[PDB]
Ligand binder design. Structure first.
Ligand SMILES: COC(=O)c1cc(Cl)c(O)c(S(=O)(=O)Nc2cc(-c3ccccc3)c(F)cc2F)c1
Ligand SMILES: Nc1ncnc2c1ncn2[C@@H]1O[C@H](COP(=O)(O)OP(=O)(O)O)[C@@H](O)[C@H]1O
Lengths: 1023, 262, 93
């Protein structure tokens, strides 16, 4: 994970945050040159460019610049520009790769002699941080590893300047000693404060003028941003010097950014017949081994890791990118897409199959006429719905798929693709069967997976004794021990869980990567914790060595970081290793066997359980030591435990390319320390087919020459395990166990719902909002589109209530209807009994509410009576004279029309503003052109009979719901008859009633009893 | 006089709000965001906050149907009753565990802003005395992926308010909190209760000794009621349209515990 | 199970309160003062307190109409609305 940074950004981080006594010349004196060079702006930036000679050189992680002739030395501004004429934008064949030189750097030349060129290099190893010094530098330094002054600096230490004076400067000149000790003792402090891993300066120049830095090569720990991101400021990591990255790779690298997943795409041959869709950081390496091992290496297209279980839409985006790269043009052989792999944490089994199915069924046209023959293999859960939907879409589209099962090996499909086969202190015993464990963090799924595994193992007691979680209060959590519900206590500070439970000896950190170091350093101080698993990935490599240091000062064995944990069948399971019991009962992990495995990658612990279950009696214990650079315990510690264990009868080792972690097995067998039969194979032989002894090919061959039963490739691994186990049975060595059926728990509902075994209908059916997802969605629109446009409250209202999006002339109108019905006054029945229950001291909700239940049939319900009168009489065809005559004859008052004070000579002003807004903006107004006639035919008898605001809102919503752009009359009757138009009054007047509550809570007034002067008591006199 | 009401004025030619007649309200462009400040505060509000309080109503309109208030509006809308009696049966859920995170975030950040505590001792006392911070904490989202509603509200606050104390405070508390867990973000329930504190202090027309009072009464509680009531009229109206029957809860979800003395 | 309710029991032959079936409630003379203690407390109550809690309901039945709750039940009963919506508008006082 330790990525590189550029020479420029490295030097600016050096100049901005180094602190030392002896000053450093040339601070902030550099010039970045692009093909977008505004030379005017740069020359305005740096007037010293017209002052001295310059050195121009590329900054693209190009090693050995000084021998490729790519370093312009000792040039003026015009000389620099002429040196940049034949290069900037052109190509250079550098080493093996070839790319465009698109970024250059200009620095001041300062003269120096040959003995003034020093070498400084600081890197990280597992036991500490080296310091390499050498008195000669330059490009003729040669191999500087075994030829310099080395100094070991231990983990979590300081750097004594006297030690540098006495050991690192024994060949340095005398007068230049003290300034270099003034420099290096500063620089390491810089090295410690920014979490670098590799900082190399060659040459280092100290003249009489002072110290200034010419070159810089640096790699930073990219997982350590959460401390140093203020220090880092803006940091850019450059790619290695190769061809240009497609925008496709940028689009997939963008899926790394905003998500929590990990999915990078490195495509190298777009015209191949072999493609990959591989889930897991480990299994992509395995397919890239086996594909290139079967001679189809010239047709391999990409290899890409995929982990973290992202959402279904991000896997859809990844798969639509790769299927968009599938269907560009035709090759006459036919493209083979390989889908399958190995995950340890099965969390989105229901989601990820909904992505890739949707990516396939959105390309059934082009995928047939580019002739794709897909091989899909499942691992882990028996997710039968995904296999069925693949099998149905393969018959519906016509795309020849071959969905397989767990019975075929994970590289058996590659031979089915490339034409090779037809198509059918320290402890020894960590975990006993009386082992307790404390789960740090809250992981009720993982703890339930503990307890159900333990009940399948016929275990007497549980294996989670207590949980610890410091960000809630102390309580207990209710789980399932088999069928009976038991409780597990959840604590806040660890002293409670470590004083009330003296029985635990394993703790399992499910912390975040920000808290794993702190929680582990909290735990290490205690005594009985004798095994710590650290699940979280992405712990910075400076923190991990501190944990390893204190783990050696206390003796506590660490399995992790970046693991998923191990599994010891019949005794104890860790984390989510082996998956849910749907995998456990199939790979037969509830009884002890006689085989032990151990792996680098935690993703392959499913595949090794699979293969060792389909050949031998069962796994005794299999441990994933995690996929980081600094494991808590390497291969050899667990191999020594497996050697010093009676029940172990054979050992399997799964390695990966990188490091001396595998030659210690050769030394342990040549010393005779490791006796038991060992079958190893490390993944990644064909990494070289895209340091020499740390390659996977040579490590496998050195294990094979030293007495480790290595197969010829990965596809013979099951065969070689089976062929060792047969010879172990046929010599009286292993006496296999008579397999007995286990007890059986019921499945979880929340797990067996995702797999599609349970089918119950949904109780509610809501059709407005959408809680889950990235953004909240209203009826059609996400909220960033609501604020992207100017929807307003008048548009959010129509968008929630009607589910139909409304145009602007009605969007502003319904805001008019809320601005009008906000208050009519305080001596009004609803506002009266909000005033009373606001004086009686109670809440805002309870004072709003006590006025809201006045809305009804005599107060505020004139609106939905005016609509249901005018719109009912509009449709029956009655011209207003017979309407007014029947309202007299049948004897009922017209619900829209009538006002207490006002006449034609003096209207309401609110009804004039609403009427003017209706006429200016609605395209067609029936039923208000009707009702204004009823004003005149009514008001020629009394002046005060006007249609009110309670009549005009109930008319203009009828006219708006009919004559908006998007409704129908048979649907716009329904929002009237439900009572939406009643509900415009509630939302209007509720502003006023919150007003009256708030106002009379401010004007601090007391409890209100009504006077006796207003009440006429009438009581029937029979005492 | 028995009552003393200080907002509206019934009688006369025109209806008058707290200062303004309604033809002046529609003569200018006051908006619902201005009629709101004109009724509740009785202080007339400028445009950059008039549009902001419409943002706070457009955000808290719905969070969803599987939410305690919307749940018991859905139930009393299926039981056949009115709009008022279906709105109301979800409004009496607003309180101290649902929807009352707003006026707890205001009364926490504004109380700790005035006592002078720089955020490290604030977070350390929220650990030591042992209480969760009422503005801060989200179920899913991190620095790497925020709420989008909190980004739209934060961008609108920065682009238009002239001076924002107590949100420049609280965004520091995001970083000092979120460097321990990623999912500790100040919510929308925290940012509305912060930006109204900052608006009532730094509007053109209030005083600090008066802008404490509209926080302590519970106006900022009441912005949630008026926001969410649009959604609850939505849920009533929607499930009166989708003609669904009476709802009894299943027996499969209820664990009866009865003391056995017959 | 999502809810955990500890008072009644719907299913079966007879409805059961907190311990007692209803034919035992009417078989003895439990009264409203005993059904009250049997629902609310889940503890069965003796007769001298069973009659007492009926006294406490017979006393707090009314204090009068010029009283803040009864006032805003009178108002929302004059505004034409239901029994529930008129009870309620005086209960939130
Ligand atoms: C997170 O991955 C799972 O959720 C999962 C679940 C099961 Cl059940 C499973 O078997 C595997 S797998 O890696 O073993 N095989 C496999 C893998 C993918 C895939 C899925 C996503 C991206 C690329 C490939 C696929 F689409 C179909 C497959 F069969 C993986
Ligand atoms: N500013 C400069 N002044 C003088 N010489 C320089 C300057 N920059 C680069 N050089 C020359 O270029 C070389 C630096 O290139 P470098 O990347 O260190 O080569 P290598 O990778 O082979 O060590 C040095 O040997 C130095 O002689």
């Amino acid at each position: 994970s330790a990525k590189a940074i550029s020479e420029q950004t490295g030097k600016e981080l050096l100049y901005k945050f180094i602190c030392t006594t002896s000053a450093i010349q040339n601070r902030f004196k550099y010039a970045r040159v692009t093909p977008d060079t505004d030379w005017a702006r740069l020359l305005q930036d740096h007037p010293w460019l017209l002052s001295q000679n310059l050195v121009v050189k590329p900054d693209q992680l190009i090693k050995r610049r000084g021998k490729l002739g790519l370093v312009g030395v000792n040039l003026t501004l015009d000389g620099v520009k002429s040196w940049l004429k034949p290069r900037l934008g052109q190509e250079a064949t550098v080493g093996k790769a070839t790319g465009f030189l698109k970024n250059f750097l200009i620095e001041p030349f300062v003269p120096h002699s040959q003995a003034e060129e020093f070498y400084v290099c600081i890197y990280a190893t597992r036991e500490g941080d080296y310091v390499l010094f050498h008195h000669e530098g330059g490009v003729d330094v040669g191999d500087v590893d075994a030829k310099a002054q080395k100094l070991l600096v231990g983990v979590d230490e300081k750097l004594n300047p006297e030690d540098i004076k006495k050991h690192l400067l024994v060949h340095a000149p005398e007068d230049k000693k003290e300034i270099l000790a003034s420099f290096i003792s500063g620089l390491f402090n810089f090295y410690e404060d920014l979490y670098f891993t590799y900082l190399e300066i060659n040459p280092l120049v100290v003249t009489k003028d002072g110290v200034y830095v010419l070159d810089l090569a640096a790699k930073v720990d990219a997982t350590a941003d959460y401390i140093c991101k203020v220090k880092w400021g803006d940091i850019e990591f450059p790619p290695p010097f190769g061809r240009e990255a497609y925008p496709e790779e940028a689009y997939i690298a963008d899926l790394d950014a905003k998500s929590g997943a990990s999915l990078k795409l490195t495509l190298l041959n777009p015209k191949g017949r072999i493609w990959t869709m591989v889930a897991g950081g480990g299994a992509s390496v395995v397919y890239s081994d086996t594909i290139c091992d079967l001679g189809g290496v010239n047709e391999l297209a990409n290899y890409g890791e995929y982990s973290g279980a992202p959402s279904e839409q991000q896997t859809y985006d990844y798969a639509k990118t790769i299927l968009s790269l599938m269907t560009r043009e035709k090759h006459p052989d036919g493209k083979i897409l390989i889908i399958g792999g190995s995950i340890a944490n099965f969390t989105n089994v229901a989601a990820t199959f909904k992505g890739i199915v949707r990516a396939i069924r959105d390309y059934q046209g082009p995928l047939k006429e580019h002739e794709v023959t897909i091989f899909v293999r499942r691992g882990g859960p028996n997710y039968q719905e995904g296999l069925r939907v693949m099998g149905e879409v393969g018959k519906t589209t016509g795309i020849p798929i071959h969905v397989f099962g767990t019975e075929t090996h994970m590289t058996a499909i590659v031979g089915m693709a490339l034409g090779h086969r037809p198509i059918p202190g320290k402890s020894t015993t960590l975990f006993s069967r009386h082992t307790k464990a404390i789960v740090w963090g809250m992981q009720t799924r993982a703890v339930q997976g503990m307890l159900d595994f333990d009940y399948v193992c016929s275990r007497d007691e549980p294996s989670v004794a207590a949980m610890v979680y410091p960000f809630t209060g102390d309580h207990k959590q209710k789980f399932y021990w088999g069928h009976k519900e038991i409780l597990i206590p959840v604590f806040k500070n660890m002293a409670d869980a470590m004083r009330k439970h003296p029985e635990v000896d394993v703790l399992i950190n499910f912390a975040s990567l920000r808290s794993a170091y702190d929680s582990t350093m909290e735990t290490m101080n205690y005594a009985q914790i004798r095994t710590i698993a650290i699940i979280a990935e992405g712990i910075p490599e400076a923190l991990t060595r501190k944990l390893i240091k204190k783990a050696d000062q206390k003796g506590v064995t660490i399995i992790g970081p970046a693991t998923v944990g191990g599994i010891k069948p019949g005794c104890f399971k860790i984390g989510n290793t082996g998956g849910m019991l749907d995998n456990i009962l199939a790979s037969k992990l509830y009884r002890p066997g006689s085989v032990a495995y151990v792996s680098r990658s935690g993703g392959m612990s499913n595949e090794l359980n699979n293969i060792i279950s389909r050949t031998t009696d069962g796994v005794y214990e299999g441990v994933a030591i995690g996929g980081d650079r600094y494991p808590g315990s390497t291969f050899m510690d667990h191999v020594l435990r497996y050697q010093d264990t009676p029940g172990v009868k054979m050992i399997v080792v799964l390695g990966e390319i990188g490091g001396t972690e595998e030659y210690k097995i050769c030394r342990g067998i040549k010393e005779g320390r490791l006796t038991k039969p060992i079958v190893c194979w490390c993944i990644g032989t064909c990494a070289t087919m895209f340091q020499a002894s740390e390659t996977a090919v040579a490590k496998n061959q050195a294990l094979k020459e030293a007495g480790v039963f290595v197969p010829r490739s990965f596809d013979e691994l099951g065969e070689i395990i089976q062929s060792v186990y047969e010879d172990l049975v046929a010599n009286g060595v292993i006496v296999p166990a008579q397999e007995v059926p286990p007890p059986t728990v019921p499945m979880d509902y929340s797990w067996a719902r995702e797999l599609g075994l349970i089918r119950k209908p949904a109780s509610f059916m809501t059709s407005i909002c959408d809680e889950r997802g990235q953004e909240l969605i209203y009826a059609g629109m996400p909220i960033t589109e609501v604020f992207k446009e100017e929807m307003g409250i008048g548009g959010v209202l129509g968008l929630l209530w009607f589910q139909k999006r409304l145009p602007k002339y009605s969007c502003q109108f319904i805001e008019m209807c809320l601005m009008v019905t906000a208050d009519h006054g305080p001596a009004v029945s609803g506002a009266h009994n909000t005033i009373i229950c606001a004086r009686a001291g109670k809440d805002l909700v309870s004072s709003l509410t006590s006025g809201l239940l006045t809305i009804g049939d005599r107060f505020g319900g004139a609106l939905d009576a005016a609509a249901k009168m005018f719109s009912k009489a509009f449709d029956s065809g009655i011209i207003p004279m017979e309407f007014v005559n029947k309202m007299k004859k049948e004897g009922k008052l017209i619900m829209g029309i009538g006002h207490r004070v006002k006449s034609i000579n003096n209207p309401d002003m609110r009804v004039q503003i609403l009427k003017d807004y209706v006429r200016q903006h609605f395209p067609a107004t029936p039923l208000l052109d009707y009702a204004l006639e009823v004003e005149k035919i009514t008001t020629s008898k009394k002046p005060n009979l006007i249609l009110n605001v309670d009549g005009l809102i109930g008319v203009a919503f009828v006219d708006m719901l009919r004559n908006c752009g998007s409704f129908t009359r048979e649907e716009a009757d329904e929002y009237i008859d439900i009572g939406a138009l009643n509900g415009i009054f509630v939302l209007g007047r509720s502003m006023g009633f919150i007003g009256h509550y708030l106002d009379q809570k401010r004007l601090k007034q007391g409890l209100y009893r009504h006077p006796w002067d207003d009440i006429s008591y009438v009581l029937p006199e029979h005492m």
